[PDB]
Amino acid sequence: MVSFTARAKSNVMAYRLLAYSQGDDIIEISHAAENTIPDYVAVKDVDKGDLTQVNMYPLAAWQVIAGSDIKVGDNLTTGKDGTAVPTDDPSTVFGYAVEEAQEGQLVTLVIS
Amino acid sequence: VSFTARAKSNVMAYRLLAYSQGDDIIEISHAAENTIPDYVAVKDVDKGDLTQVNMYPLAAWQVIAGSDIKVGDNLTTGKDGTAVPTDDPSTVFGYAVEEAQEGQLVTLVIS
Amino acid sequence: TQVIVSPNIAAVKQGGQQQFTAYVRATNAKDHKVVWSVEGGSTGTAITGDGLLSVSGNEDNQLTVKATVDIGTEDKPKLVVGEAVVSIRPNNASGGAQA
Amino acid sequence: SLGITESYDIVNAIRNSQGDNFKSYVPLATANNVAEVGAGILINQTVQNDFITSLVDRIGLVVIRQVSLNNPLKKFKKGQIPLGRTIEEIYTDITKEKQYDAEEAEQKVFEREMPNVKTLFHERNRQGFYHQTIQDDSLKTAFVSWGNFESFVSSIINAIYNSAEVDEYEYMKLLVDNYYSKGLFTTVKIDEPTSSTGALTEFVKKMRATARKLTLPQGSRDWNSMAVRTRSYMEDLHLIIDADLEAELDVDVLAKAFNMNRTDFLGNVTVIDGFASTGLEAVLVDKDWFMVYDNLHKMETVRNPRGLYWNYYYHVWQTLSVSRFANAVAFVSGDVPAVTQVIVSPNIAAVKQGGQQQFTAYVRATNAKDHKVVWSVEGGSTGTAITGDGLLSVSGNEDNQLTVKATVDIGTEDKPKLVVGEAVVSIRPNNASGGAQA
Amino acid sequence: TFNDVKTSLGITESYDIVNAIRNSQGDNFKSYVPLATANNVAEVGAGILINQTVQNDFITSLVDRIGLVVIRQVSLNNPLKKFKKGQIPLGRTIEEI
Amino acid sequence: TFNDVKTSLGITESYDIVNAIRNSQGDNFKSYVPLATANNVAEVGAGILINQTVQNDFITSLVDRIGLVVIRQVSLNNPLKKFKKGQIPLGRTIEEIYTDITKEKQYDAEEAEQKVFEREMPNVKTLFHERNRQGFYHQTIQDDSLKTAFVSWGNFESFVSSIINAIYNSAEVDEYEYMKLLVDNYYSKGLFTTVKIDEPTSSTGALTEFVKKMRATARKLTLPQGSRDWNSMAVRTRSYMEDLHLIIDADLEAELDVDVLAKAFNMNRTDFLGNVTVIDGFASTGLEAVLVDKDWFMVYDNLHKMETVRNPRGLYWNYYYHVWQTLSVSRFANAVAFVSGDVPAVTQVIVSPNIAAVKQGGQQQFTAYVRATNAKDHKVVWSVEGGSTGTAITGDGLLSVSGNEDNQLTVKATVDIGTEDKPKLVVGEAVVSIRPNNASGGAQA
Amino acid sequence: TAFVSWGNFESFVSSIINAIYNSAEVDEYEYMKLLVDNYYSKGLFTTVKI
């Protein structure tokens, strides 16, 4: 994979959808805003001032926290706190569920 | 990785596919005309037959041509899951790197 | 009457995975769904809906793998819970975000 | 208490027992200590000694459970093949009595009466191995004696062996269902057994009627799937049935309760967990109906030097197939077709051009009615046809391979459902002339 | 019978040698840097007061056991036994004159 | 292969002796001025790293040969292997048990009437060692490609033997660093009995004041009655003078060697009185001259295994030499670290047998053993952090738990040192589990 | 219950016996330093000041 250094700027939690921004000579990361398309997924807790890395790779699927109950095949978007939630507005869809998840459980997703 | 799909209605090899959902398991059928397909059949799959979707993110696909495709042509879904040339962005799912007659397979790079 | 988790004693690295398996002693002849749940604290360790644990990189605490079956009904909940204990191996060789 | 879901606390139930059922544990002392470590701790918290508290109560005995998971169907195995792939199972059948005639005997001293010999061809089809890894050096911490260390190492090899007896059981449940998925059992329609006490008597009747019919020393043709005059022995029948009917039968009937330990009354009753297919309630087979052989039993190991483990591989290659020559009956409930199969004639032939081979369709019907067979000839190119009684008649310049079919059509006149029985017929050339007759 | 005892029981952590090795910059812990398992030496290399069940690394259900009991035997002696004079069973009083 | 290169490759070159200096001044470098070939000797006379195919000076088609191959061999031995104590095949943990002395009672015939079968528990402290390191030394020798690099068989074997001696040296280098690490672990965890000294390097009085504390502690460790102090478990134990091992480094020897012994008409009276061994380490600050019993080291062995595999496709062997050891420290032996510099007022507060296991309504006295460094202060403050509502320790160590006491307790012996505004505490701890009483319980009159 | 060895169990029961005699050696040493401190407290030592 291709790794690079990035700094959290707002208490990154594991399995949350992440977004990024241009900071002080470094890419800064945080939980993705509600109702959008995320760029990266957390797989480690990284606090507000903590420095970490990002492992680049065209992953087939992500495992993220379900922000609500999810049915197999549901199109997903970002929700509160960077969780993944069911939707129906194409422009905010970043992937879809291949398995059932209850709120708070991990849900595997396939990118689109 | 891969996942179980339940097919939907007579999937043919090399045709462009699209996903849906019903009872539970993701349903697979031929992609509708003039849009962006989700998967390429590697083998024929019966209407209600369960199978696998091999998610090994490919940069290029081998898809049956629905019409005369030239090198560099932008492609979209045609009829019956075949691939056809298009001049209308948003329907584009990739482009050809090969030339093909009709019913021939054509290599295309997804974009 | 019981839910038996597949491995009572597990040992998962930072970032590793472990499948667990729910074994429902249903005394009637009906199907019962197992809710999976992971408690234990430190970081965002969660589990998949079918039982695959994904310990999250900075996990320091002793985990706990719950397996809940709701017998009874709505507003009268009876929650038969199985239990598995996970310790962590410190595989502190990883990154943060991943795409 | 780790994953324990109580129904009540027995410690409260005995202490708060002012005279009820728990009054036998009131005279007991230390019932609380049996109430705590009764079921057995899962994680073994370290316990200090009771007198000198600094000392540690040590683990005193390692008990390694050595349960062997055996196969019920292992006695149906018939040996081993070190070299080879297939098995040519052949069978000669009955010829017809002729009447002693001295006057006819003059011109027929050298008459050819062909034997009726049929074959089946099995093949090695199971190639599966097993795998267990043993880290012998890091397991030396968990042991104090060399005997307990080695008995645990040998526990894992036998767990491969318990695994091999698991899978070869499951393939032999598969060999039955495969054979019933293709309509090759002889099907007895039954009522659903658990609906009625009377339909349990009708079950044991239709089984023991069949067990007497299968072991008729007369022989019959009506039970093997190649329609060959053959015989079962009563000490070789094997009722393969689930546990659920077996308990219903040996209680409600009271004829099986009198005969639960008998070798007759179908007998050699082999309880299974149950069949995967739907109406397959029981299976009455001969012990020769299975032809499980063993092509390989290897245990190849390998050492990893870097990781200090032994890595075991245990190879089981077998020949898992069944014999159609033996007697075999499925007792089937549900919606059952009127005919399962048309068993056909000599299934292969080498008829010379201008020759004739009389065929015989055997119709394994379930409704005990009289069905019509419709003979037809497919393949070929030169107008070869067949009569209605089954007489093929190769034309005389026929060159292609012929496939003679015998159908029943148990369906309806608006929607047919044909049960086609088939037999392929090759052609030998004939240099004779022919061409037209009168 | 104990429920939770960490290995720093009654321990003053004077300079925390793990940070003294892995965050060394040039200092005299340079030679502990090429050591592969200093963290498993520095964690429990000072003797453990209260024993704790250690699950087996390969198979997580087996318990690693006790391989040796060293019953330490120490003799103490009176230094001033040379000043002892004798033994007197009979009578009680000793009269110097 | 290689193209051109400089001759000075890894050379930093503080000054150029060749042209910038020897050609330059009429100074002390006049002894090197008349040398005709000095500019060549100063060039490649340090050795070169990359070999060129230098041609021959007369027949330019010829090449110059390697005239000699000097395989140099080293043998590395652990200076501390004499402290190693054995091997364990099976098991992981070591149960080292100390039994301690008990207390006298008075003779009384009238009371002895009713207390014949009374019981008194022994005083037994135990400690625990478990396996610490698990490592291996990978090495790979590809014998057939190495035949291209030699001309003699006698050099080929002496080189392939040398790589087998690159491990078995590294197994002795890393074992030494682990046995030094047990010392610095034991000082960082704060468990030595520190005798505060001055730095002996500074003044020769501070050196001679150090020899006095050295010989005193050595005489104190070996008093036949034994002594409660000088170890971390605080039992009465007695060392043997042949079993004391003073572990100094090489500098502190030469202080004693040049200053103290050189000017000693009676050498045995300022001797170190131990089996003096020499290191070059201790790594921390002010730590030097660790004076231990030989029973202090609990270094055992678990595996010495050389496991080989051969790749047949590529013609090489792998040499995985596994070393598994139990590297630990007994506290029942007594150990002194003469730490110079500034040390705290109290290093540790050793408490009672830390496994008390008291019944509800019972009592237990907890004895504090303050390891003070200087002379005197430091009353102990007691504490019953843990369960409460009845559990109350006195100014001495009596616990007096409860009838309702359930949870385990943490009996703390707190000593306040330093500043009243930022109170640095030395807190010794003791654990006690609470078993139920079951008689004289429930309600009460 | 604390030993899985008879060779260790009779080394620890024999060890408790030696802790009795070490209690005798230690106290009898302390009783003989007690006779010296008693004789000083009563002032029956002649006293040389240094």
Distances (CA, A) of E97 to D264, E94: 115, 10
For chain A, the chains sharing at least 3 beta-carbon pairs closer than 8 angstroms are B, C
Using a CB–CB cutoff of 8 Å, tell me whether E85 touches chain D. Answer: no
Nearest CA in chain E to C10: E60
Chain G neighbors of D49, CB-CB under 8 A = 1-2
CB atoms within 10 A of CB A95: 23
Q: Between chains, do F101 and G19 touch, taking CB under 8 Å as contact?
A: yes
Using a CB–CB cutoff of 8 Å, tell me whether D60 touches chain G. Answer: yes
Distance spanning both ends of chain B, measured CA to CA: 21
Within a 13 Å sphere around the CA of B33, how many CA atoms are in the beta-carbon half?
5
User: Which of F124, F316, F437 to probe by mutation at the D interface, max D CB count within 10 Å?
Assistant: F124
Looking at F101-222, which runs of residues are DSSP E strands?
A: 123-130, 133-141, 193-196
Q: Between chains, do E47 and F430 touch, taking CB under 8 Å as contact?
A: no
Alpha carbons D49 and F130: distance in angstroms, whole number: 20
Closest partner residue to A71 (CB to CB) among B20, B21, B38 is B21
Distances (CA, A) of D279 to C51, D119, D284: 34, 30, 14
- C-beta of residue C84 within 8 angstroms of C-beta of residue C8: yes
Alpha carbons D320 and D341: distance in angstroms, whole number: 23
The C-alpha of G19 sits at a distance from chain D's nearest C-alpha, in angstroms, of 14
Using a CB–CB cutoff of 8 Å, tell me whether A104 touches chain C. Answer: yes
Among F174, F181, F214, CA closest to F284: F181
Chain E neighbors of G8, CB-CB under 8 A = 69, 71
- C-beta of residue D222 within 8 angstroms of C-beta of residue D187: no
Chain E neighbors of C87, CB-CB under 8 A = 55
Alpha carbons D312 and D298: distance in angstroms, whole number: 10
Nearest CA in chain F to E8: F189
Alpha carbons B29 and B24: distance in angstroms, whole number: 15
Using a CB–CB cutoff of 8 Å, tell me whether C29 touches chain D. Answer: no
The C-alpha of D78 sits at a distance from chain E's nearest C-alpha, in angstroms, of 39
Instruction: Identify the three-state secondary structure at position B94.
Output: strand
Strand partners, A97: A109
Phi first, then psi, for residue F138 (nearest 5°) are -70, 140
Using a CB–CB cutoff of 8 Å, tell me whether E60 touches chain C. Answer: yes
Using a CB–CB cutoff of 8 Å, tell me whether D115 touches chain F. Answer: no
- C-beta of residue D245 within 8 angstroms of C-beta of residue D206: no
Distances (CA, A) of B93 to A74, B36, B89, E24, F433: 22, 5, 9, 54, 70
- C-beta of residue D135 within 8 angstroms of C-beta of residue D152: no
Q: Between chains, do E56 and D143 touch, taking CB under 8 Å as contact?
A: no
What are the residues whose beta carbons fall under 8 Å from the beta carbon of F413, sequence distance 6 or more?
A: F349, F351, F366, F368, F380, F381, F382, F383, F397, F427, F428, F429, F430
User: Which of D48, D53, D55 to probe by mutation at the G interface, max G CB count within 10 Å?
Assistant: D55
The C-alpha of E51 sits at a distance from chain F's nearest C-alpha, in angstroms, of 7
Using a CB–CB cutoff of 8 Å, tell me whether F134 touches chain G. Answer: no
| Amino acid identity, position D52 | I
Q: Between chains, do A45 and C44 touch, taking CB under 8 Å as contact?
A: yes
Closest partner residue to C80 (CB to CB) among D2, D5, D43 is D5
Chain G neighbors of E73, CB-CB under 8 A = 15, 18
Q: Please tell me the experimental approach by which this structure was elucidated.
A: cryo-EM
- C-beta of residue F438 within 8 angstroms of C-beta of residue F405: no
Q: Between chains, do E67 and D144 touch, taking CB under 8 Å as contact?
A: yes
Closest partner residue to F99 (CB to CB) among G15, G26, G29 is G15
Torsion D387-D388-D392-D397 (CA) sign: positive
Q: What is the resolution of this structure in A?
A: 3.2
Q: Between chains, do C48 and A101 touch, taking CB under 8 Å as contact?
A: yes
Q: Between chains, do G19 and F97 touch, taking CB under 8 Å as contact?
A: no
Among B82, B79, B81, CA closest to B100: B82
Chain A to chain B Cβ contacts (< 8 Å): 30
Among D77, D112, D133, CA closest to D313: D133
Output the DSSP codes for G1-50.
---S-HHHHHHHHHHHHHHHHHHHHHHHHHHHHHHHHHHHHTT-S-----
- Tokens representing F160 are 């392939």
Using a CB–CB cutoff of 8 Å, tell me whether F415 touches chain E. Answer: no
Nearest CA in chain F to G19: F101
Touch criterion met for B and F (3+ Cβ pairs within 8 Å): no
Alpha carbons F127 and F299: distance in angstroms, whole number: 15
What are the residues whose beta carbons fall under 8 Å from the beta carbon of C13, sequence distance 6 or more?
A: C55, C88, C89, C90, C91
Using a CB–CB cutoff of 8 Å, tell me whether D144 touches chain E. Answer: yes
Using a CB–CB cutoff of 8 Å, tell me whether C65 touches chain D. Answer: no
Using a CB–CB cutoff of 8 Å, tell me whether D30 touches chain F. Answer: no
Within a 13 Å sphere around the CA of F427, how many CA atoms are in the beta-carbon half?
14
Q: Within its chain, how far is the Cα of F191 from the centroid?
A: 12
Chain A neighbors of C15, CB-CB under 8 A = 43-44
Alpha carbons F165 and F321: distance in angstroms, whole number: 12
Spell out a b/e string for B42-56, using b for 16 or more CB atoms within 10 Å of the CB, else e. eeebeeeeebebebe
Nearest CA in chain A to C36: A105
What are the residues whose beta carbons fall under 8 Å from the beta carbon of D329, sequence distance 6 or more?
A: D185, D186, D187, D188, D210, D214, D223, D283, D284, D285
| CA torsion, ordered D136, D139, D140, D142, to nearest 10 deg | -160
Distances (CA, A) of D176 to D11, D170, D289, E80: 52, 10, 10, 94
Using a CB–CB cutoff of 8 Å, tell me whether F136 touches chain D. Answer: yes
- Strands C97-98 and A51-56 come out as parallel
Instruction: Identify the three-state secondary structure at position D166.
Output: helix
DSSP state of D181: H
Among C82, C6, C86, C96, CA closest to C40: C86
Q: Between chains, do E34 and F132 touch, taking CB under 8 Å as contact?
A: no
Q: Within its chain, how far is the Cα of B12 from the centroid?
A: 10
Chain E neighbors of C9, CB-CB under 8 A = 55, 60-61
Distances (CA, A) of C46 to A13, B1, C93, F140: 11, 20, 20, 43
Closest partner residue to E41 (CB to CB) among F178, F284, F300 is F178
For chain C, the chains sharing at least 3 beta-carbon pairs closer than 8 angstroms are A, D, E
The C-alpha of G23 sits at a distance from chain F's nearest C-alpha, in angstroms, of 5
